[PDB]
Design a protein around this ligand. Structure first.
Ligand SMILES: [Gd]
Length: 204
């Protein structure tokens, strides 16, 4: 009925569409698979880009959710292989409770967190730079673990912020796709960071 529920209705469908993509993604051969470095940082770059995009439709978000799902399996399989499959469940479980807890608090809190926009914008740019640096010169385990905890905190704060702005701002019906897409990217980026963190933590 309300705009918040319609956004979260779209959000759940992108999760479902992504899960089918993830299943399909297992059949991609190693020849057609991009480097792990590139795949991880591309999601940070798209999270930044898709936030500032104008006039996004329902066809874009659902097709994006599907394709991104396919390009998530290489990362999932990597960290499951180096540290056991249990880290994928730990990562997904931790993402789900963080999103539920922070999403609920953000959506019903009386304080308006609009002032954080600049703080979170520069943090994503920093992660983007360090992620791009990682392609050419790969960071060691401890720097990657440090990078992962920081990314976890930034993308946890974005969920709080995003649900908070949905309540506090006058969101028109034409922004339902773009707001759900940002929730999807926040979720996916939080998952990747927890997965890498717990992946490396159990790696040695
Ligand atoms: Gd790998």
């Amino acid at each position: 009925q309300s705009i918040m529920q319609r956004i979260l209705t779209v959000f759940v469908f992108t999760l479902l569409i992504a899960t089918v993509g993830l299943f399909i993604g297992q059949f991609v051969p190693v020849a057609l698979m991009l480097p792990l470095s590139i795949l991880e940082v591309a999601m940070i770059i798209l999270a930044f880009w898709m936030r500032r995009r104008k006039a996004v439709g329902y066809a874009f978000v659902y097709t994006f959710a599907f394709v991104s799902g396919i390009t998530l399996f290489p990362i999932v399989s990597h960290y499951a292989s180096i540290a056991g499959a249990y880290v994928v469940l730990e990562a997904f479980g931790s993402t789900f409770v963080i999103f539920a807890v922070l999403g609920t608090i953000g959506a019903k809190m009386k304080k308006d967190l609009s002032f954080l926009w600049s703080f979170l914008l520069v943090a994503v740019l920093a992660l983007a730079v360090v992620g791009i640096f990682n392609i050419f010169s790969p960071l060691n385990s401890a720097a990657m673990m440090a990078y992962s905890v920081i990314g976890t905190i930034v993308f946890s704060l974005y969920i709080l912020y995003d649900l908070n702005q949905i309540k506090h701002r006058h969101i028109t019906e034409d922004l339902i796709p773009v707001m759900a897409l940002s929730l999807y990217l926040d979720f996916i980026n939080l998952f990747i960071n927890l997965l890498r963190f717990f992946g490396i933590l159990s790696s040695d």
